[PDB]
Design an enzyme around this catalytic site. Structure first.
Site, PDB file in Angstrom:
ATOM      1  N   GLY I  22       0.628  -1.404   0.080  1.00 58.21           N
ATOM      2  CA  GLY I  22      -0.077  -0.161   0.063  1.00 58.21           C
ATOM      3  C   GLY I  22       0.931   1.361   0.229  1.00 58.21           C
ATOM      4  O   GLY I  22       2.167   1.286   0.261  1.00 58.21           O
ATOM      5  N   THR I  23       0.111   2.247  -0.248  1.00 59.14           N
ATOM      6  CA  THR I  23       0.696   3.972  -0.310  1.00 59.14           C
ATOM      7  C   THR I  23       1.099   3.920   1.098  1.00 59.14           C
ATOM      8  O   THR I  23       0.832   3.389   2.100  1.00 59.14           O
ATOM      9  CB  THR I  23      -0.659   4.624  -0.370  1.00 59.14           C
ATOM     10  OG1 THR I  23      -0.985   5.056  -1.583  1.00 59.14           O
ATOM     11  CG2 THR I  23      -0.520   5.890   0.499  1.00 59.14           C
ATOM     12  N   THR I  24       2.261   4.814   1.177  1.00 58.64           N
ATOM     13  CA  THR I  24       3.144   5.123   2.386  1.00 58.64           C
ATOM     14  C   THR I  24       2.430   6.136   3.461  1.00 58.64           C
ATOM     15  O   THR I  24       1.749   7.208   2.901  1.00 58.64           O
ATOM     16  CB  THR I  24       4.593   5.363   2.245  1.00 58.64           C
ATOM     17  OG1 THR I  24       5.117   6.201   3.194  1.00 58.64           O
ATOM     18  CG2 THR I  24       4.732   5.808   0.851  1.00 58.64           C
ATOM     19  N   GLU I  39       0.346   9.464   1.591  1.00 63.19           N
ATOM     20  CA  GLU I  39       0.615   9.716   0.453  1.00 63.19           C
ATOM     21  C   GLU I  39      -0.692   9.495  -0.521  1.00 63.19           C
ATOM     22  O   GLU I  39      -0.938   8.059  -0.527  1.00 63.19           O
ATOM     23  CB  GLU I  39       1.854   8.901  -0.284  1.00 63.19           C
ATOM     24  CG  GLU I  39       2.102   8.649  -1.694  1.00 63.19           C
ATOM     25  CD  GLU I  39       2.832   7.301  -1.990  1.00 63.19           C
ATOM     26  OE1 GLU I  39       3.932   7.638  -2.486  1.00 63.19           O
ATOM     27  OE2 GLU I  39       2.867   6.261  -1.529  1.00 63.19           O
ATOM     28  N   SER I  67      -2.337   2.027   6.036  1.00 55.13           N
ATOM     29  CA  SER I  67      -1.871   1.709   4.631  1.00 55.13           C
ATOM     30  C   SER I  67      -2.371   0.283   4.229  1.00 55.13           C
ATOM     31  O   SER I  67      -2.276  -0.451   5.201  1.00 55.13           O
ATOM     32  CB  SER I  67      -0.442   1.674   4.533  1.00 55.13           C
ATOM     33  OG  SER I  67       0.244   2.605   4.957  1.00 55.13           O
TER      34      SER I  67
END
Lengths: 235, 243, 233, 232, 198, 241, 250, 111, 236
Positions: I22-24, I39, I67
């Site tokens: 996942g996105t940070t 993010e 995330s």
């Protein structure tokens, strides 16, 4: 509780297979009584025989069963059959007709066959009883929930052997004492022990009680089986 | 793979692989604990490892205050540890409400042991990957240590240890009680019992401890408490000027 | 690796994927194309319906949800019925209990949460449909994209279904044009009609082929089919 | 072999797809929707000459303005019919009017979704009239999807039947023409010779409602078809 | 109060039941049969609260017929009356008890005895040579105490009832509009459909 | 709460549990029924695993549902007791609410319905039973014969057979039964029945059993001897070169 | 959450075996040996207190348990399974018998009830059989002294004498040799201690042996005087001191 | 004891013409001898060209009108925007009221 | 409900993979509060800026960001909210952060106990100010959580963690809320390095005793631009 491509019930067939390894029980029906004989599974000297019961169970005062299979599974079924009989008596003020009680136990068995995903009971019964509609009656039930009525029948180990012999020696006008003899003789030739002794047998009779006009259930004690073994010529 | 590897049914040898695997899980944190009994107290010690620098070290603990009188240390992963912690807390409060006296140490152990036994037998619940060591000064029994595992087993101890280097610590203690001839630490103050415990921990692990490599719980008549870094530091100083 | 890891929705693959959810997502790609776009005064749905035969109907793909909200579907149609029905209720509950028209954003959050449960409960299955949600509330016009994974995103325009990438590409470039079509419904519809075209190897979009729905500042949600759409071909 | 509501990698529901296969093995059913009425015909398909043909109920009334033909595992259709009837009578009870044909169909398809352990093994052609939308024909699959058709055929002979319906249907078919066409197209696809005992006709008109044609009125049209197709 | 009488003679059981149905200030019907055949040799008569009366009788009837068809066998009067008793005794403690009193008249073929069972809504059962429910009992019990003999013929039993009815027509406040009479013997159940002007 | 779906579809569109239920039927002893001008006759067979049986007390294959309707079955005997009970309960329930006994068609529809339900409910297997249901509607003279199977399909038959070797007997019946002329006598209707069973059973001894239903709840079983009078008449007379 | 295994985990194999019950019996075999001997004026049940490290307190583990004042139990196999069965058995002796008849159950009937609980785990959904065999010894006014064995299937049977677990075969043979129907209680204790010397590897003292009798009524173990119509519990755990005293003259 | 009912007065009148209808009411809302409001309307447009008043206990009246408006909304949803005829509305209102036969809306309702 | 032979739970382990994917997102503790940041991948030009809010509030004082599977995150917050409501109802005071942590802990952990439920595919970073200080927490799919000075999860977790480690070492005195906001913007920019095939939007929230009175608030307008600017500066 599922069907094979052949149209048989896996868990049932395997349950009957289970029963075929169980001590043999025979029921023979006379003109004036029923005999119940059963053989205990490879036992010991230290096994208490006096207060022992494992194959012959009283259901009410007019009806007994012989068990071939899982002892504990049969304890469950015996208890709920005992209850059904008392429900019937309470409702009607009349003892339950043998057939009705047999049908109910069989219907219970049938359930496990068809729904719930529980395993069938690994048990077969011989029912010996009396009612005033049909007199003396002998029935059989197995884990399929199927029940049929018999002049003489056996369940458990060596039924093929035992069934041959009963057909050979049974004749309609039999008396109870001859049926007792036939029961013991048949077990003598189908045993797996060297010979048949008293501590390996359970024995029961449903007679007309000498002089009365009333029905009697007798479950033979150790010493009583030992004796009835002498008279017949098996000592 | 056979179902006897995934659920708690028997294997042909009469075994429960899920339970065995749950015992394995108990060592996952790579921490050793030990518990000993004083004349009128009970002490538990556990290594404290804070690898990550980003962690708040005050929140990293494997010791639990169950009730006023009962402490518990867990060997196993924290989620499971906290599950057992919350349940034991609930059970200890329920007991007091229903029965009017504080739940004794061994009774809570038995109750948790039974809870674990159920997971041993029912297929939809996995066992918990933990060993729980319960300690207190019981009002009827005095200093008490009772330990339960994922099998549903529990027993009382004179002393005990749990973790990767379990056997080393155990024998180290066994050896002390062989020579001392008694079943407890013959010291009046709990501070000396803590000191004893750290010392024997050191001599069986071959390691030196600073104030942040340990965790101490002490149980006294009518109180169980944990020590602060500074109390532990003062304990480490006293062992220095002796051993 | 793809073996015993697509049995149910309650199972993770070693990669960290949920294949049942991925497969449900695949029912959308197989679905007929639909487009959504909005300016600051109106929001529009354009759905190319699909027929089974030359003798069949072009199954309706636009469902009204309240006076200010509605959606277009691509995927399993029954699943669009379950969810839009749930949305009708949530809109309704908002009106009765609070005398409040339900915010499009809340509708998105609610759909997300409903789809999520089916990605986690045993013996259930993910929803096999994607949804484009338009609405007009107290913060203006809105378009949302619903994915059966439970992912919802707010956009100026988008398209889902068969060859949707064509329309989505066109929209990514026509952006600054259509966003400014304020107080002029017919041009925004036209911009929707021309967007859906970049997704047809198929053919000419015809009278019974086309479906348009619009909602706006002083315009409640309304679906146009057949005769009414003739002026847009 | 894993689950009932499981998705294939192609994003279809296994069990729903396999139920569609069962329907393909079913007796043929054809429906034609005109401006003078809607006709439904079926293939009886007795599995033996001892079967009493008129005991084969594959066309059933739902309400006076709505009838329905089935194809597939016809036993599964029982509870759909029952539910359809309850929905139509209940609607009349709550609203003092006839239910719309589309609403009745939507309701049956709602029932279809409730898998109950499995999907239905039967598809239905639902035909009738309402004031709003006139004469209508609907195909209802066990997926819960339904479709409106000018003409449709379901069952084993449906591929060839549909093709023939594609040529022969136009927006000006009289009811009597439509009857003849159902009979004709059935004669082509039936694995037996079409007579009054192995095929059943029915229609719904605004004025007379849903009527099953008795064997006598059918036999006449069969005779009229044999002739219309002799001269040409 | 409706009239429900039962007399057990030597070879049969006879039931007489009032024909009137009265709601309020009107006699709605003068030819009511307050009786259900339970099996070919068992007959039940009933009185009590308006709707409960038939709903109960017909539920009892359904259960007995079911049993017969299941066993291809007729239950004894003793058995049927125990079924009914237990049903009432259940009802008395439920949310809304059945307010029905019954007479069960049967011929037991196994014993060859006729039998009369009196059961009230509470589930109180008793076997009697003669019985009644309601106010009517206050006149008939003593009358029959005097005139009844254990070894009477069916024709004699019918003359005993005639006395009972005539007494009830002299002394009861309400017009019960005569009685329907039915006999249960070895040959089953029949109606003496000519009792009123005879 | 066990609701694991047992009756499911296969890729070719067959429900194999329903299919194997049919296999259990064809395993069961044969049962046949044929209808006359003023009657319907039901005939069965018995097996020979053992013959030290008591016939007075053993469950007969023809069951009374109400006094005017009977049911015979091929398949699992234990399953059939359950279908019979429910049919008996319904028959009483229809009398109670409609104040009329069931029509044969109605009782048939009910039983077929119960079978169907068992083909689509979680954690239940279909009935390993197919049935012949026969009798007369109340106040009606036209005879009725219906058949149900494990799927829930049902239909009426001039004559029909089910169970082991029914393929053979359906062959016989298809040539012999005339739609124009039903066996106008009770007698000659029992004739066509015993003939059809003789192909499969062997000697019509302690194995073939027969039941006759006439209008107005007139239902008589036969005795061994009255059966033997039919066994004899066909063998010797239809032996002619 | 929710139980999602609603079917039997013990089913029949094509040979008619019930696998899980067999495997449970295998588990019992690994168990530490335990025995019971029925005398004319008592019953004795005994086992080894297999310690895990000398740091464990052997006394704190109950291997022989009081079920009712006249009934005891001992086991072989999985300790945690035994412990929960003892709890359910104690409770059922009350709910099913003492709360109904105002007196504790006769041995055969309590045994019948344990048997029931074990059978149930043989057939219910989502469970495995108990991995124990029990030996139940007791007395009641009408049947006198008795001894029963209950197995994973829920089968039970009465014995004059028996043993279960690791060295069961060896011990059954040893008892068969030594048992006669005229044994006093002290005779049976002595025979029990001899039979149990075989089983055991290491130390053999009163702190490694758990042994209890069902004998005469112990009035001083009642806790109250004044109701002369009970003299008290027949069940009696032997103390470490009592075991050793019989081991010196052994 | 709590009394779940009240009476807020008011009066409604309906007249039908050949090709129109009127439904009128006063705007006064009362409790015992007090005036709650001089202008609280109790005749409402319900869509589909139906006006409705439910006079008596105003809490019950408001609940009913609310429920009928909703019934109209769902009629449109479930039945392809069909116009709800006056007889159909009437029959639907019967069912609304009868659902509360054992805890009634205390209103006289006119449409 | 399945241990693998090494004592781990293989289903939890695969959940972790989904998180790593996942996105940070990050959280930084400061001396009187906590800051959160995420993010947001710009899939398309068509996404409405500032309009797909990832950060969520619990009660009034608790921030949550995660995330992994976004639906799994939302489910968790919904439950957190009920667990907050239930606590306030009974005990009046708003839920202390350690207490709120165990509530999510036990719930997430419960989804690792049964074979008919799958674990959560998110790691959640959450915290806020309660009666005795600021608290930062991160909770993994197993239900494991601890307190943190700084926390990161997602595709760029390693680069973000290294940056956090630097701050902790170079600010033993403590960081300021105002500052941590800028620093979080820097860290998300640095972390975007390991996910740069897409453009991204920055989202930040905070809960500071003196800057928000101990309530959770989003960082918008002026302060958000100053943070973006500061982060743009230390990348050129």
């Amino acid at each position: 509780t599922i069907f094979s491509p052949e149209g048989r019930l896996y868990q049932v067939e395997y349950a009957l297979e289970s029963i075929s390894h169980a001590g043999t029980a025979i029921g023979i029906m006379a003109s004036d009584g029923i005999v119940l004989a059963a053989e205990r599974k490879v036992t010991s000297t230290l096994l208490e025989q006096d207060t022992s019961t494992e194959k012959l169970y009283k259901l009410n005062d007019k009806i007994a069963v012989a068990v071939a299979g899982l002892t504990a599974d049969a304890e469950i079924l015996i208890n709920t059959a005992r209850i059904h009989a008392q429900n019937y008596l309470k409702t009607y003020n009349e003892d339950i007709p043998v057939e009705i009680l047999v049908r109910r136990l069989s219907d219970i068995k049938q359930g496990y066959t068809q729904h719930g995903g529980l395993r069938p009971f690994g048990v077969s019964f011989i029912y010996a009883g009396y009612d005033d509609r049909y007199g003396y009656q002998l029935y059989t039930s197995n884990p399929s929930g199927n029940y049929t009525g018999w002049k003489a029948i056996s369940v458990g180990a060596n039924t093929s052997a035992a069934q041959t012999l009963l057909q050979m020696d049974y004749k309609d006008d039999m008396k109870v004492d001859d049926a007792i003899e036939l029961a013991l003789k048949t077990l003598s030739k189908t045993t797996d022990s060297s010979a048949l002794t008293y501590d390996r047998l359970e024995f029961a009779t449903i007679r007309k009680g000498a002089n009365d006009g009333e029905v009697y259930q007798k479950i033979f004690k150790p010493q009583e089986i030992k004796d009835i073994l002498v008279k017949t010529g098996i000592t | 793979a056979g179902y006897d590897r995934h659920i708690t049914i028997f294997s042909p040898e009469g075994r429960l692989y899920q339970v065995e695997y749950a015992f394995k899980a108990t060592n996952q944190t790579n921490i050793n604990s030990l518990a000993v009994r004083g004349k009128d107290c009970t002490v538990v010690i556990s290594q404290k490892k804070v690898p990550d620098k980003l962690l708040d070290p005050t929140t990293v603990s494997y010791i639990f205050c169950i009730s006023r009188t009962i402490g518990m240390v867990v060997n196993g992963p924290i989620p499971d540890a906290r599950n057992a912690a919350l349940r034991a807390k609930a059970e200890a409060a329920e007991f007091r409400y229903k029965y009017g006296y504080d739940m004794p140490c061994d009774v809570l152990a038995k109750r948790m042991a039974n809870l674990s036994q159920i997971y041993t037998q029912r297929a939809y619940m996995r066992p918990l990957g933990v060993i729980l060591t319960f300690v207190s000064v019981d009002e009827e029994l005095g200093p008490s240590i009772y330990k339960t595992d994922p099998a549903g087993y529990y027993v009382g101890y004179k002393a005990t240890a749990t973790g990767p280097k379990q056997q080393e610590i155990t024998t180290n203690l066994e050896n002390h009680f062989k020579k001392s001839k008694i079943d407890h630490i013959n010291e009046e103050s709990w501070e000396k019992v803590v000191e004893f415990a750290i010392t024997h921990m050191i001599d069986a692990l071959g390691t030196e401890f600073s104030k942040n490599d340990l965790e101490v719980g002490v149980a006294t008549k009518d109180k169980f408490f944990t020590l602060s870094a500074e109390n532990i530091e003062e304990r480490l100083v006293a062992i220095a000027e002796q051993d | 690796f793809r073996n015993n890891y697509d049995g149910d929705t309650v199972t993770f693959s070693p990669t960290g994927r949920l294949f049942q959810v991925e497969y449900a997502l695949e029912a959308i790609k197989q679905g007929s194309v639909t487009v959504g776009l909005r300016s600051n005064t109106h929001a529009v749905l354009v759905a190319l319906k699909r027929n089974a035969d030359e003798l069949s109907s072009y199954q309706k793909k636009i469902i009204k949800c309240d006076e200010h909200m509605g959606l277009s579907l691509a995927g399993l149609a029954p699943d669009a019925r379950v969810l839009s029905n749930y949305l009708r209720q949530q809109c309704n509950y908002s009106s009765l209990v609070f005398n409040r028209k339900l915010a499009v954003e809340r509708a998105g959050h609610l759909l997300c949460d409903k789809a999520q449960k089916n990605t986690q409960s045993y013996g259930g299955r993910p929803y096999g449909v994607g949804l484009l949600i338009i609405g007009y509330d107290k913060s203006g016009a809105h378009l949302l994209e619903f994915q059966p994974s439970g992912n919802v995103t707010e956009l100026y325009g988008t398209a889902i279904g068969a060859r949707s990438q064509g329309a989505k590409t066109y929209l990514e470039r026509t952006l600054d044009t259509f966003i400014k079509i304020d107080g002029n419904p017919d041009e925004l519809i036209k911009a929707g009609v021309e967007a859906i075209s970049q997704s047809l190897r198929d053919e000419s979009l015809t009278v019974d082929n086309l479906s348009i729905a619009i909602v706006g500042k002083d315009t409640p949600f309304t679906i146009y089919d057949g005769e009414a759409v003739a002026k847009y071909i | 072999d894993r689950g009932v509501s499981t998705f294939s990698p192609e994003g279809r529901l296994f069990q729903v797809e396999y139920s569609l296969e069962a329907i393909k093995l079913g007796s043929t059913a054809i429906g034609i929707a005109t401006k003078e009425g809607v006709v439904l015909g079926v293939e009886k398909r007795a599995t033996s000459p001892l079967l009493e043909s008129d005991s084969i109920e594959k066309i059933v009334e739902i309400d006076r303005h709505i009838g329905c033909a089935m194809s597939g595992l016809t036993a599964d259709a029982r509870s759909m019919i029952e539910h359809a009837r309850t929905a139509a009578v209940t609607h009349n009870l709550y609203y003092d009017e006839d239910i719309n044909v589309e609403s009745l169909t939507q309701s049956v398809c709602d029932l279809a979704l409730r898998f109950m352990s499995r999907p239905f093994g039967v598809a239905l052609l639902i035909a009738g009239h309402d004031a709003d939308d006139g004469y209508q024909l609907f195909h209802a699959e066990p997926s819960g999807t339904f479709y409106r058709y000018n003409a449709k055929a379901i069952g084993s002979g449906s591929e060839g039947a549909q093709a023939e319906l594609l040529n022969e249907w136009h927006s000006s078919l009289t009811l009597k023409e439509a009857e003849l066409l159902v009979l004709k197209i059935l004669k082509q696809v039936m694995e037996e010779k079409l007579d009054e005992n192995n095929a059943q006709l029915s229609c719904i008109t605004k004025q007379d409602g849903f009527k099953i044609y008795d064997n006598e009125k059918t036999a006449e049209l069969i005779k009229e078809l044999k002739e219309k197709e002799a001269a040409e | 109060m409706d009239i429900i009488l039962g007399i057990r003679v030597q070879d049969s059981v006879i039931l007489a039941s009032s024909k009137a149905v009265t709601r309020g200030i009107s006699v709605l019907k003068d030819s009511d049969d307050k009786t259900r055949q339970l099996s070919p040799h068992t007959l039940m008569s009933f009185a009590g609260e308006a709707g409960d009366t038939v709903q109960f009788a017909e539920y009892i009837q359904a259960n007995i017929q079911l049993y017969s068809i299941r066993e291809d066998y007729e239950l004894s009067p003793q058995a049927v009356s125990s079924f009914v008793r237990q049903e009432l005794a259940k009802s008395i403690r439920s949310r809304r008890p059945y307010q029905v009193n019954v007479l069960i008249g049967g011929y037991d073929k196994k014993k060859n005895k006729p039998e009369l069972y009196q059961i009230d809504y509470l589930g109180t059962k008793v076997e009697l040579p003669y019985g009644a429910h309601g106010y009517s009992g206050f006149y008939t019990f003593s009358l029959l105490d005097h005139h009844y003999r254990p070894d009477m013929t069916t024709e004699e039993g019918l003359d005993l009832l005639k006395l009972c009815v005539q007494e009830l027509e002299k002394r009861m406040p309400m017009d019960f509009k005569g009685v329907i009479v039915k006999i249960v013997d070895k040959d089953g159940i029949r109606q003496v459909d000519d009792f009123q002007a005879q | 709460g066990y609701d694991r779906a047992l009756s499911i579809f296969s890729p070719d569109g067959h429900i194999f549990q329903v299919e194997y239920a049919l296999e259990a039927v064809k395993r069961g002893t044969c049962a046949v029924g044929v209808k006359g001008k003023n009657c319907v006759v039901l005939g069965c067979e018995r097996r020979s695993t053992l013959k030290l049986q008591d016939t007075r007390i053993t469950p007969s294959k023809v069951s009374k549902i109400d006094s005017h309707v009977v049911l015979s079955f091929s398949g699992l005997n234990a399953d059939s007791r359950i279908l019979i009970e429910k049919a008996r309960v319904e028959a009483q329930s229809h009398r109670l609410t409609l104040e009329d006994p069931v029509t044969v068609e109605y009782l048939t529809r009910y039983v077929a319905g119960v079978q169907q339900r068992y083909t689509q409910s979680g954690g239940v297997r279909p009935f390993g039973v197919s049935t012949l249901i026969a009798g007369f509607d109340p106040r009606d003279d036209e005879p009725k014969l219906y058949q149900t199977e494990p799927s829930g399909i049902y239909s009426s038959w001039s004559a029909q057979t089910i169970g082991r070797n029914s393929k053979t007997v359906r062959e016989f019946l298809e040539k012999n039964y005339d739609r124009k002329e039903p066996p106008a006598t009770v007698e000659e209707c029992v004739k066509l029945t015993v003939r059809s069973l003789l192909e499969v059973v062997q000697t019509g001894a302690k194995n073939i059993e027969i039941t006759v239903v006439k209008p107005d709840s007139d239902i008589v079983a036969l005795s061994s001897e009255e059966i033997n009078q039919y066994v004899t008449q066909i063998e010797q007379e239809k032996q002619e070169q | 959450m929710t139980d999602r295994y609603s079917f039997s985990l013990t089913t029949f194999s094509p040979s008619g075996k019930l696998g899980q019950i067999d495997y449970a019996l295998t588990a019992v075999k690994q168990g530490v040996t335990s025995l019971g001997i029925k005398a004319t004026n008592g019953v004795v049940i005994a086992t080894e207190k297999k310690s895990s490290s000398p740091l464990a307190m052997s006394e704190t583990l109950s291997k022989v348990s009081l079920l009712t004042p006249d009934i005891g139990a001992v086991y072989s196999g999985m300790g945690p399974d035994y412990r929960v069965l003892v709890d359910k058995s104690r409770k059922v002796a009350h709910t099913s018998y003492k709360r109904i008849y105002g007196e504790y159950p006769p041995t055969k009937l309590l045994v019948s009830e344990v048997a029931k609980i074990m059978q149930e785990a043989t057939q219910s959904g989502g469970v495995r059989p108990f991995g124990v065999s029990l030996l139940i010894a007791g007395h009641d006014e009408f049947n006198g002294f008795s001894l029963y064995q209950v197995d994973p299937s829920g089968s039970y049977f009465p014995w004059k004498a028996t043993a279960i677990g690791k060295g069961s075969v060896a011990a059954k043979t040893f008892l068969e040799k030594r048992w006669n129907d005229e044994l006093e209680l002290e005779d049976a204790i002595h025979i029990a201690l001899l039979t149990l010397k075989e089983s055991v590897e290491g130390e053999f003292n009163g702190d490694t042996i758990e042994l209890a009798i069902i004998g005469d009524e112990n009035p001083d173990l009642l806790g109250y005087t004044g109701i002369p119509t009970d003299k008290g519990p027949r069940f009696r755990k032997l103390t470490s001191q009592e075991i050793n005293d019989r081991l010196e003259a052994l | 004891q709590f009394n779940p009912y009240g009476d807020n007065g008011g009066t409604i009148l309906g007249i039908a013409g050949e090709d129109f209808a009127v439904l009128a009411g006063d705007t006064r809302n009362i409790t015992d001898y007090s005036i709650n409001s001089r202008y609280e309307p109790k005749v409402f447009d319900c869509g589909d060209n139906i006006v409705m008043s439910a006079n008596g206990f105003a809490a019950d009246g408001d609940a009913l009108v609310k429920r009928f408006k909703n019934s109209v909304k769902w009629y449109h949803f479930d039945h392809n925007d069909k116009k709800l005829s006056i007889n159909s509305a009437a029959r639907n209102i019967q069912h609304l009221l009868y659902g509360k036969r054992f805890f009634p809306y205390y209103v006289h309702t006119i449409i | 409900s399945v241990f693998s032979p090494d004592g781990r739970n293989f289903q939890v382990e695969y959940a972790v993979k989904a998180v790593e994917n996942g996105t940070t997102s990050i959280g930084i503790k400061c001396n009187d509060g906590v800051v959160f940041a995420v993010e947001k991948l710009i899939t398309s030009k068509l996404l409405v800026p500032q309009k797909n809010v990832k950060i969520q509030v619990v009660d009034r004082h608790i921030g949550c960001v995660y995330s992994g599977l976004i639906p799994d995150g939302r489910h968790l917050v919904n439950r957190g909210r009920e667990e907050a409501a239930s606590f306030k109802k009974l005990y009046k005071t708003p839920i202390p952060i350690p207490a709120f942590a165990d509530r999510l802990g036990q719930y997430v952990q419960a989804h690792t106990l049964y074979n008919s439920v799958r674990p959560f595919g998110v790691s959640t970073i959450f915290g806020g100010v309660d009666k005795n200080g600021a608290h930062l927490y991160m909770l993994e799919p197993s239900g494991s959580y601890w307190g943190y000075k700084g926390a990161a999860t997602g595709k760029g977790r390693q680069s973000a963690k290294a940056e956090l480690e630097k701050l902790v070492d170079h600010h033993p005195e403590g960081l300021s809320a105002r500052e941590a906001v800028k620093q979080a913007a820097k860290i998300i920019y640095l972390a975007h390095e390991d996910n740069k095939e897409k453009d991204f939007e920055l989202e930040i929230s905070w809960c500071s005793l003196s800057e928000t009175n101990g309530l959770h608030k989003f960082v918008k307008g002026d302060l958000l631009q100053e943070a973006i600017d500061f982060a743009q500066k230390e990348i050129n």
